[PDB]
Enzyme design. Structure first.
Site, short mmCIF file in Angstrom:
data_model
loop_
_atom_site.label_atom_id
_atom_site.label_comp_id
_atom_site.label_asym_id
_atom_site.label_seq_id
_atom_site.Cartn_x
_atom_site.Cartn_y
_atom_site.Cartn_z
N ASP A 148 60.96 24.42 95.00
CA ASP A 148 60.69 23.97 93.62
C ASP A 148 60.28 22.50 93.61
O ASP A 148 60.71 21.73 92.75
CB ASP A 148 61.91 24.22 92.69
N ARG A 152 58.60 16.79 88.19
CA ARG A 152 59.83 16.91 87.41
C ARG A 152 61.12 16.84 88.25
O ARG A 152 62.14 16.43 87.74
CB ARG A 152 59.81 18.19 86.56
N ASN A 153 61.04 17.24 89.51
CA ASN A 153 62.18 17.16 90.44
C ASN A 153 62.18 15.93 91.36
O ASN A 153 62.88 15.91 92.38
CB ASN A 153 62.26 18.47 91.25
N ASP A 166 66.43 18.07 93.16
CA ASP A 166 66.28 19.43 92.64
C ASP A 166 67.26 19.57 91.48
O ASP A 166 68.45 19.85 91.68
CB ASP A 166 66.56 20.47 93.75
C1 LIG Z 1 67.06 8.78 83.01
C2 LIG Z 1 67.68 9.72 84.02
C3 LIG Z 1 67.77 11.10 83.76
C4 LIG Z 1 68.33 11.94 84.69
C5 LIG Z 1 68.82 11.40 85.90
N1 LIG Z 1 69.36 12.21 86.83
C6 LIG Z 1 69.85 11.75 87.98
C7 LIG Z 1 70.44 12.69 89.01
S1 LIG Z 1 70.66 14.31 88.25
C8 LIG Z 1 70.86 15.49 89.54
N2 LIG Z 1 71.46 16.60 89.29
N3 LIG Z 1 71.58 17.46 90.34
C9 LIG Z 1 71.05 17.05 91.45
N4 LIG Z 1 71.13 17.85 92.58
C10 LIG Z 1 70.14 18.06 93.47
O1 LIG Z 1 69.06 17.51 93.34
N5 LIG Z 1 70.42 18.91 94.49
C11 LIG Z 1 69.53 19.30 95.50
C12 LIG Z 1 69.57 20.65 95.86
C13 LIG Z 1 68.72 21.12 96.84
C14 LIG Z 1 67.83 20.25 97.46
C15 LIG Z 1 67.79 18.91 97.11
C16 LIG Z 1 66.82 17.96 97.78
F1 LIG Z 1 65.81 17.68 96.86
F2 LIG Z 1 67.40 16.75 98.15
F3 LIG Z 1 66.24 18.55 98.89
C17 LIG Z 1 68.64 18.43 96.12
S2 LIG Z 1 70.34 15.45 91.24
C18 LIG Z 1 69.80 10.39 88.24
C19 LIG Z 1 69.22 9.54 87.28
O2 LIG Z 1 69.17 8.36 87.52
N6 LIG Z 1 68.73 10.05 86.13
C20 LIG Z 1 68.15 9.22 85.19
#
Ligand SMILES: Cc1ccc2nc(CSc3nnc(NC(=O)Nc4cccc(C(F)(F)F)c4)s3)cc(=O)n2c1
Length: 290
Positions: A148, A152-153, A166
């Site tokens: 994904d 957006r991610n 993600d």
């Molecule tokens: C203004 C605003 C809005 C929102 C906001 N949000 C945040 C973090 S939110 C967050 N939730 N869940 C998360 N988990 C996640 O990504 N897991 C994951 C699973 C599989 C693979 C991988 C990868 F990509 F590393 F390979 C990662 S990351 C910080 C911030 O500063 N934000 C600022």
């Protein structure tokens, strides 16, 4: 045990930032987290709870994947409830919103502390693309398949540092970016993922190709002119996204290298990164000619 733990009293919630179906995200102060700063701002994801397993699995995975262009995860707070996950705060939010807020229509107002006014320049766009590719090199290296990858991610922090994540939450703000059957990011998927339901490193480079297109269109939706079914038809039949106005032919060539129909014929993310970084780091005399 593998995961770092944070005491609930060291987290002070300030206000909400976002909210999905599986959680809420808050801006918070976190004390005694880093030797540098006794107090610092963080983003706290509170679980909306079965889900504890996914939560703990996600925490273990995030701890493993830590790197320069992957989202910085500090640890968990499991003492009492709700279960919290603690992340670095990225002040510009997700890359899609950031791109849209500095489009070809942007002027002086859009100017800021980290970014010039007006549309992001070729040099800035390449720097974003390069950072995302570097993140995907690292995941490819560890043999992890994202499934994904989209703007957006990705998150954007101070000094326009860009990091991959993600967000379960992407399914809510960007609901039209998924086709509900389970939610599939069809517009970002190669023909083998749509047709045969196979996801690999190679399907991720295809998706990165689409990310590159998003970046150079300032965050437009791929195949925005098409319904979900029309988009499936297009992708499965071999239609390719047009060169964006802002994209030089050299960069469109890198996109096409990602979109070779046969997975094994696609360029490696390492090669893609190598080319984009060279371009991001190239002098203005060179970049002005592309
Ligand atoms: C203004 C605003 C809005 C929102 C906001 N949000 C945040 C973090 S939110 C967050 N939730 N869940 C998360 N988990 C996640 O990504 N897991 C994951 C699973 C599989 C693979 C991988 C990868 F990509 F590393 F390979 C990662 S990351 C910080 C911030 O500063 N934000 C600022």
């Amino acid at each position: 045990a593998c995961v770092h733990h944070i005491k609930r009293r060291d987290i002070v919630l300030k206000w909400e930032l976002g909210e999905g179906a599986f959680g809420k995200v808050f801006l918070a102060e976190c004390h005694n987290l880093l030797p540098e700063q006794d107090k610092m701002l963080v983003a706290v994801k509170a679980l909306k709870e079965s889900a504890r397993q996914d939560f703990q699995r996600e925490a273990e995975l995030l701890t493993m994947l830590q790197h320069q262009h992957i989202v910085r995860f500090f640890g968990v707070c499991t003492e009492g409830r709700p279960l919290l996950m603690v992340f670095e705060y990225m002040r510009h939010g997700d890359l899609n919103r950031f791109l849209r807020s500095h489009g070809p229509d942007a002027k002086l107002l859009a100017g800021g502390e980290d970014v010039a006014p007006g549309p992001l320049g070729l040099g800035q766009l390449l720097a974003v693309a390069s950072q995302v590719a570097a993140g995907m090199v690292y995941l490819a290296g560890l043999h992890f398949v994202h499934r994904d990858l989209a703007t957006r991610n990705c998150l954007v922090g101070q000094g326009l540092v860009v990091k991959i994540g993600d967000f379960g939450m992407s399914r809510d703000i960007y609901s039209t970016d998924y086709y509900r059957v389970t939610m599939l990011p069809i517009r970002w998927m190669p023909p083998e993922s749509i047709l045969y339901r196979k996801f690999t490193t190679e399907s991720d480079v295809w998706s990165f190709g689409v990310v590159l297109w998003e970046i150079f269109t300032y965050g437009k939706q791929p195949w925005y002119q098409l319904s979900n079914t029309e988009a499936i038809d297009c992708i499965t039949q071999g239609r390719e996204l047009e060169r964006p106005r802002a994209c030089p032919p050299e960069v469109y060539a890198i996109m096409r290298g990602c979109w070779q129909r046969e997975p094994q014929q696609r360029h490696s993310i390492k090669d893609v990164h190598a080319r984009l970084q060279a371009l991001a780091q190239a002098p203005p005399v060179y970049l002005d000619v592309l």
